Amino acid sequence: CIKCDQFVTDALKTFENTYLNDHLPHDIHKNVMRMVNHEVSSFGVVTSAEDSYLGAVDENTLEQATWSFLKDLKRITDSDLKGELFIKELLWMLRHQKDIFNNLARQFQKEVLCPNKCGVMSQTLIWCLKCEKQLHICRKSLDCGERHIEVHRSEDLVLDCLLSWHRASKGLTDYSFYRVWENSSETLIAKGKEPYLTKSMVGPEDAGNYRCVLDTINQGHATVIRYDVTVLPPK
Ligand SMILES: [Ca+2]
Ligand SMILES: [Ca+2]
Ligand SMILES: [Cl-]
């Protein structure tokens, strides 16, 4: 994906126009750049199989890969290498950075990509072949499950609808909280950016069922959690 990044293509222009002069005779510059561009353009190419993980990463991972690449490219131009030794180390550096990119992509795939265990998460990916940015949808069943909540009369009732991946999901709008009556109809009792609902001084009338619905701009609901609330007598 690093060919997609302006910093990389700016750096490669400077590499060719300014720094190669210091390391190589002019009449090998253009073919050396063909080697460099070829290597760089292959980052994240998939060859079917089990390396589809290579094909897209999020913007943070691209950024890490870009800066890793820039550091190693500068190391090369700052070096005292010339001639064949320079070319050899340049190619090895590009192969090494490709491995680093692959390790970053594998880490992204394992820990960061679609970490939700329920609900629908949206993530922003850069696709490495043609540099397209796209919203990726991680779709699982919307209902995340049911909380059993007990609260003593006259204490505060708090319903929490925050999941760990909500902060990273894209396009979220509001959390709606509903009271779900015994005839199964429901009443909207809060709606806004707050991932929780507070009801002060609960009484027996607050006992029953509630539901949170987290919505998105255009990808449908992202989370539902249900709450079964018992109001206990005072201690
Ligand atoms: Ca960012
Ligand atoms: Ca030689
Ligand atoms: Cl869990």
Q: Closest-lying ligand to the alpha carbon of 59?
A: 1
Residue 130 inside a domain? The answer is: no
Q: Is 76 exposed, middle or buried (0-12, 13-18, 19+ CB in 10 A)?
A: middle
| 122 bridge partner residues | 137
Q: Closest-lying ligand to the alpha carbon of 62?
A: 1
Residue 80 shares a structural domain with residue 166: no
As a whole number of angstroms, the distance between CA 139 and CA 85 comes to 50
Which CATH number goes with the domain that contains 198?
Answer: 2.60.40.10
Experimental method: X-ray
Residue 120 inside a domain? The answer is: no
Rounded to 5 degrees, φ, ψ at 123 are -130, 155
Cβ pair 104, 126 in contact under 8 A: no
Residue 176 inside a domain? The answer is: yes
Q: Closest-lying ligand to the alpha carbon of 85?
A: 2
**Ligand 3: centre distance to CA 221 (Å):** 20
Residues within 5 Å of ion ligand 1, judged at the Cβ atom? 59
Distance of CA 121 to the CA centre of its chain: 10
As a whole number of angstroms, the distance between CA 213 and CA 211 comes to 7
Write down how long the chain is: 235
| Residue 51: other Cβ atoms inside 10 A | 14
Residue 71 shares a structural domain with residue 161: no
Residue 10 shares a structural domain with residue 97: yes
Return the residue matching tokens 């922003």. 124
Residue 8 shares a structural domain with residue 107: yes
As a whole number of angstroms, the distance between CA 211 and CA 177 comes to 6
Cβ pair 157, 199 in contact under 8 A: yes
Residue 71 inside a domain? The answer is: yes
Number of structural domains (the chain) is 2
As a whole number of angstroms, the distance between CA 128 and CA 137 comes to 18
**Ligand 1: centre distance to CA 60 (Å):** 5
As a whole number of angstroms, the distance between CA 190 and CA 175 comes to 8
| Residue 118: other Cβ atoms inside 10 A | 16
Q: Closest-lying ligand to the alpha carbon of 115?
A: 3
As a whole number of angstroms, the distance between CA 17 and CA 111 comes to 40
Query: Residue 218 has which token pair?
Result: 């255009």
Residue 151 shares a structural domain with residue 206: yes
| 209 bridge partner residues | 180, 228
**Ligand 3: centre distance to CA 164 (Å):** 11
Q: Closest-lying ligand to the alpha carbon of 83?
A: 2
Structural domain for 217, as ranges: 142-232
**Ligand 2: centre distance to CA 85 (Å):** 8
As a whole number of angstroms, the distance between CA 45 and CA 172 comes to 31
